[PDB]
Design a protein around this ligand. Structure first.
Ligand SMILES: [Cl-]
Ligand SMILES: [Cl-]
Ligand SMILES: [Mg+2]
Ligand SMILES: [Mg+2]
Lengths: 347, 347, 347, 347
């Protein structure tokens, strides 16, 4: 897979601002734009349809949605609709849901409910649910009728009228953190969205993606390994680094101990950070974030530093660098700084 | 409620055509535009967001969506997003799902699964599910956090960031056919979407809506009674009538016997029509549709005939006339004929 | 005329940012959005059409265009097109051109060329050119054919196919600074756009607008007197005031001596400012701007100060307060501060 | 130049319909969309900006605009704005104006007024005016400042802030009918828009375009020779042919005698057609159009016939086939028939 840059925006801000930033990213050479799917924010279909209207080249899609909060045939319809309206630019980001959001919604997490197979009662693994949603979506994109009986979803004979433009050429990316999801993604996905920003995370993740690819007779180069990063760039390195703190603080808090161990993180001023958060004291949280946490969980600094860090990620197997929150002290100026002083070094 | 005209479009056609027709309706004085929610067609969020971009005054919303195929917090987010993007023009159409579509999806119908309350197993009546989805949506529109524990949905503490423009002023319309849904709609809805086109249907339905309104201390005039009609208008009455046949044939097929009895329908050349359909022989189906079926199940003819029919519906309690399929031999010319020779008679 | 708030944006920034800011203004209660017409920036038709797509209620139009750089029939077409696409929200801002821009283009200023009457050679006064362009535009909006023979424009029999939505109800605002333009605007315009921010300017201008209105048998209340202001608002008054300096410096430079005299301006540290500018030394320019210049040529400060200043403008006859550059240190936060803490005081 | 298909739409219809048809063309493989520039219709900037929002791949631009009705710096701004909003898809179509429209506007035709050089009085040839407008536009697209002193336009030092995306890569197409314009286009244009639909017209035109190209050291293959055709396609050849009549009737009327001679046209039932038109009797006009006129002035018939006709045009040097009015009995179905049964034969 060729090297590319993506942008991931949480749609909590005004939809028109989110659309405007995606146009700035397109104008600056970014090739992918991912919009998160959480009920508490503006809906990905509304925000991406508005972004589709305001852009012409960048690929657009949910990053990431899930098999549970909407029937897979509804997700298929959304993707086909976004693809048609955008002139064939849709992409799919699919994951297993997320704990913080599912707890708020009232859904269990991991969610093992065979929600869309009414006659089943047996729990279903999230990786299996994702495989099934994928089959339903692509049967829909091929024009149907969709006929699928799995453990998590069982359809009737579902005819399809809506047509996309790319059809089954729409890329399927899977969110993956653990070994099971990483292996499944190497087997069935066009790409993998890994929430990580450091080469060490990919030295661990890529071999597992490759293991799944081999079992499917695929080469690792058929898979776009996308790093969903905490990213911060500014001509003033100190300012860029400072902007990452609140985000890194939350990352440190939600990182399993093997991840903290991997990055040699002060497990003391960790969780101690988790106590500052949840307590609503983000001020002490930010104060506790040190240089090792910033190096482990973000790509931050001036263009030179950022370019150096991306070179190391690419060596570790990353092929799509997704610029995520905070992006930079000023999001728009940050995107432009990436297009002007980072992307040209990788063309 | 004041008299108004709405338009209902199935989004199976190109999204840009559907958006264009909604703009033509707005330009012609229609005040509501309803887009159906069926997985087999383009998604209502994509189509309505595109229509929102291409229009400025007409109210926009799903007509009708349901409590089952998406978590109610996702439906709330969709509505708040459409409202924000449209500058405060969203409306909600909520029903219990529909048999033809749910069978295709693999969901039972009626759907009594307490889908969004994982710890519950007991069946829940569709009217109760609709009441619960309504509470969740309006808690979301008030800014949350949404905290609701019902029989069909149980949430955690769901904070909300997305903000709409109308907030809880967004109108809530309920689809209703039977006595239980009609009474529930009079109790909790700003309006009722009744799939019918004849005064006799409303002479039966309105008293039941009124019964629910009284139990909630409301006057019937607080409720917009909307007729979701089979509508066909043309300067050539014969051409208008002919265009209704395929649609009336399907209506005749899916009408319970009390409805056929109500309209004195030839129960013989009924079901005989149902056999022509399902058999894929629509040609004999159309040939069987007679004048009584057309009078019972559509508003069809030249402007004079249409105006006369609407006057009788208004006398029966209808306050919003929703022009639905086929609309007319030429949909755009039909919409214009309504704006030029029908609406001015009712202003 | 009722009290209203408008926003004026120079379209030198990204079109999507300009459109986004207009949506923020609409969401905050602004009722007018004016986009300047200068060849060096993005075109008003492109920017306003994009803004029309992203908004639903705010009125939109050029503020201000002119009779010279485009044939009046082309300007009419632009206005009818913007009106149709926006669902009947167009407004017209028409002035005589501007020296800085016309010099750059190569056109004389004042421009007295009977540009659009090929057989004429005699000079035509700008106020007469504006009267003629107005007649051509409204004949076009009435559906034509336009047939007009004046001193500045002579048409053939120009049929018109394009239709607007408001027709001749589209408001005609005239830019006016001197006595002749002010009187003409009171006679023929629905509103007047006066580049000024202080009550003293309106105590001079309003009586002249009123004189023209009386000669046309009109009451002054039929005319929307709009102040095109240098505006700066922030919760930190000092920060708001500082943001106005570069803009006030340019205003001081281009102000005729009667205006400087009117505001008791240090004519010494004036022109001395004009020498700093033109010399490219804006740093000394800003340093020279004092409190009297800021009070004379801008509405700047915290919400309390701003509200007090608007009250005095309204007493002087202003009915539309147009928030113009810089708007505030952060344009979007400034617009929101106006919607939250200024507009509600005037409702 | 590679073979491509374009679509040319007169914007007299609803802007949203024109935008929708351009999206249908894009979805069907058309690579260019041209919108005429006549004051009596909706403005090209409004219609193309709306089309830009609704499309993502097709190239968009005025086809054709002119040097006279707007200052060339305003045309430059329009093009840069359309290019930016469309994500770098703008194209320029530039011609000398047109008699029917200029007479209606009151401008002479040919228009030889040095309109934009106030100190000049000497007449300027239209080909020279087009060369000058081209220089001004590209200086603007290079970022300026534009400084140009010609016979038809003389600017001051015109700085430029607006930026396009393609910069000087935006293609410049010139409308050309006669020898002088054809030669000029071969010398200075990326393409030529020739109003003709038959191989004989191109056997005459191409050598002249080639003569200009050689004088500029260019190969004929650097020039996209675009046929602006009267086009009509339908699965029913007779229906397709019938749809061309009104349009061919007008073409026959406005064709110089050398063109009528070239196509062996009955000069009797010609002008006799011109008398039916202008007299408002289009019914006799259509009745007079014969097979030779249809063969000479349109590409009409079923897909097989159309494909055969395009093959002959390509042999005559055409490289872009522009489908123009009527397009087909049903414009949308016609566009789809071209994408499904014509374009694939030429890929
Ligand atoms: Cl959805
Ligand atoms: Cl223009
Ligand atoms: Mg686009
Ligand atoms: Mg709108």
């Amino acid at each position: 897979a060729e090297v590319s840059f993506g942008i991931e925006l949480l749609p909590d801000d005004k939809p028109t601002k989110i659309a405007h930033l995606i146009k700035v990213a397109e104008d600056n050479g970014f090739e992918y734009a991912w919009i998160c799917d959480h009920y508490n924010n503006y809906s990905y279909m509304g925000v991406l349809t508005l972004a589709a209207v305001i852009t012409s080249k960048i690929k657009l899609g949910p990053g990431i949605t899930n098999p549970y909060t909407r029937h897979p045939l509804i997700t298929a319809s959304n993707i086909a609709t976004l693809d048609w309206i955008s002139g064939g630019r849709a992409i799919i980001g699919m994951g297993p849901g997320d704990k913080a959001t599912f707890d708020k919604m009232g859904l269990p997490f991991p969610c093992k409910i065979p929600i869309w197979n009414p006659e089943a009662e047996d729990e279903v693994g999230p990786a299996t649910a994702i495989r099934e949603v994928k089959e339903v979506i692509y049967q829909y994109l091929e024009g149907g009728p969709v006929e699928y009986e799995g453990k998590y979803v069982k359809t009737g004979t579902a005819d399809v009228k809506a047509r996309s433009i790319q059809g089954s050429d729409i890329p399927f990316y899977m969110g993956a953190q653990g070994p099971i999801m990483l292996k499944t993604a190497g087997e069935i996905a066009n790409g993998v969205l890994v929430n990580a920003s450091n080469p060490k995370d990919f030295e661990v993740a890529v071999p597992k993606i490759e293991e799944g690819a081999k079992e499917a007779g695929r080469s690792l180069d058929e898979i776009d390994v996308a790093a969903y990063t905490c990213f911060s760039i500014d001509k003033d390195e100190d300012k860029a680094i400072e902007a990452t703190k609140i985000v890194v603080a939350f990352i440190v808090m939600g990182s399993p101990d093997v991840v903290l161990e991997r990055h040699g993180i002060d497990t003391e001023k960790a969780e101690q950070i988790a106590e500052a958060i949840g307590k609503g004291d983000f001020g002490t949280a930010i104060g506790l974030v040190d240089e090792d946490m910033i190096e482990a969980f973000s790509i931050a600094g001036d263009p030179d530093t950022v370019v150096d860090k991306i070179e190391e990620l690419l060596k570790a197997g990353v092929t799509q660098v997704v610029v995520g929150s905070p992006i930079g002290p000023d999001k728009e100026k940050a995107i432009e700084l990436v297009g002007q002083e980072v992307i040209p070094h990788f063309k």
